[PDB]
Symmetry: D2
Subunit: 190 residues, 4 copies
């Protein structure tokens, strides 16, 4: 039986397991240090391709709203941003495989300029994991072929979402003020 109800139930379980297996790997002490490193960044570049780029943009929209300076989709433009990073800036490199040439190149360029590279990647030995100062692991679990990318994205978002909440915690008043101003402005477009 391959009914839509069976598919929905199986996919929700696949996503639950990706959330569980990804969370199980977290080093929470080290995650807090990563959050503080991001909070001090004068500029943050989030890199990625495909679904990983969308995960990165989803985080970027929230970071922008709460006041971070965040760099877009074009891989060659991304390379130009990476070479312009400076000491204290942060690159968040989102790549499940950790082996996309464009993302590896941007991580190499950012590190060479003295920026801090934080990789969000699968639990595998990749060029990106070898370049990053810190790596946060994303595990999709054993997925069915039709839903591999969706469960991967679920795992990736579980990490970026936690980064966002941790950043809100460090600057709660300003975050609340900026959320309120943002809501007031967009409500004027109704």
């Amino acid at each position: 039986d391959d009914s839509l109800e069976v598919i929905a139930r199986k996919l929700n379980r696949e996503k639950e397991l990706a959330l569980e297996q990804t969370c199980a790997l977290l080093d929470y002490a080290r995650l807090q240090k990563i959050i503080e490193v991001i909070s001090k960044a004068p500029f943050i570049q989030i890199t990625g391709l495909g679904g990983s780029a969308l995960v990165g943009r989803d985080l970027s929209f929230k970071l922008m709203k709460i006041g971070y300076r965040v760099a877009e989709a074009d891989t060659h433009v991304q390379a130009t941003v990476s070479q312009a990073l400076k000491k204290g800036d942060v690159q968040i490199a989102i790549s499940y495989s950790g082996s996309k040439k464009e993302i590896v190149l941007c991580a190499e360029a950012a590190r060479k300029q003295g920026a801090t590279v934080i990789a969000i990647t699968s639990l595998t030995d990749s060029p990106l994991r070898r370049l990053a100062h810190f790596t946060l692991d994303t595990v999709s679990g054993e997925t069915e072929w039709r839903s591999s990318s969706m469960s991967t994205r679920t795992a990736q978002n579980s990490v970026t979402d936690l980064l966002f909440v941790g950043l809100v915690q460090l600057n709660d008043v300003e975050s609340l003020k900026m959320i309120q101003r943002s809501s007031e402005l967009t409500q004027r477009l109704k």
Copy 2:
């Protein structure tokens, strides 16, 4: 206690409940009809803003890969696409509130041209729900303020992901061929 471990556990539960409550509302017979309507569309426009736009782009990348003609982010460009739709085309309008003026306007324009409007929206009585030919419900559950948008996105993706798998089912051989050709091409960029 507001430790990162507590936050992660609570957020994963919030997401599990959003998946559960969204799936519980599905009419699976009607979902199959919606999937078949999409499968016959000569052109599909996916509309949305903010996080809903990212959910839509995530679905769009997968639909493009398996051969669908899919329309981008600019709300005024979206309006120009909506007025150019024709009978048989489909608009998938993704808006949790269902009350963003730009999205409502695009749905009105698409319907006027004879296109089919499928809304993906919260369980509320909105202008978008009143304009759509079919509505699929997305329920975030009762969320904490720091994670409301993330659990909403989880619920939205649960619906779009099911649409994707249902579309693969209807054209499995061609979908597999296109996935293979796509993988071969992108591997050449390694």
Copy 3:
């Protein structure tokens, strides 16, 4: 003297010469045939990177408004679209160098699927020019280093703009109706 007034005068002359030298190469009989090929395309993909991608998006917004089905920035997504093109579809490949691996790969994939490839590229012997069924030449002229990309873009837009006007000519009534509907809709967002 490197005053802003001198810079502005020199840049305007550089752009005038790029328009002139690009127009001088046009084969107008062959351009009309290219326009008719585009007008018959059930689906059009416009590929490019960097500034060439922006030139392509500028054309795409206008084509969408007048009713064409047009495919975005992600180079790996572009590859997935190219492999899904069919006989009768058109790829407009915009690349000044004609040697960006991603664009060459997409042109190869489109041609393999039977689609028609129209290259918009510099007057040089490139892999893209060798793959295209038709090539339209864009000449920047001899540019100063600070403005090379701007004069290149001016030349590229001179070709795409002519394609747009030629397409309006072939379907003038429908184009006017769609422009009016588009204007009416966007004015409602004022």
Copy 4:
């Protein structure tokens, strides 16, 4: 006669006149002050919709390459960035009409936060011109209906291109270093 050769000749003249009439309005002393204000900005947001957004992105890619921190297309995201600007940051608001509600709202929000607003807009009395600290004028000239948007874009790019060259002048060594690093990186993707 409405041949493609006649169209091309007329469009090139229309563009030449837009460059001429836009340049004729420049106050070069005030332009130099605007360039210096931009050069000191810790963060620059470029706003716009439609073709104006593409003009802004074209400038943004160049500014990013030479080291500026630059904010994207979503109008509601743009609003969230505008409310997060600070004293010393710059908003470059590109809108020919100067009356798009989204752009006016972002300019109001940026000014309220103490940021400097530079408008690039038509020679008309608009809400945006009334909000901006500095306005640079873009004149399309008297255009034919089929090419109004293209000549407008030509005029807009003439202003942004001059801003870019002026910024290169103020930091020539660093600009050259960053151009070289950028070229070396992207050549590795060949």
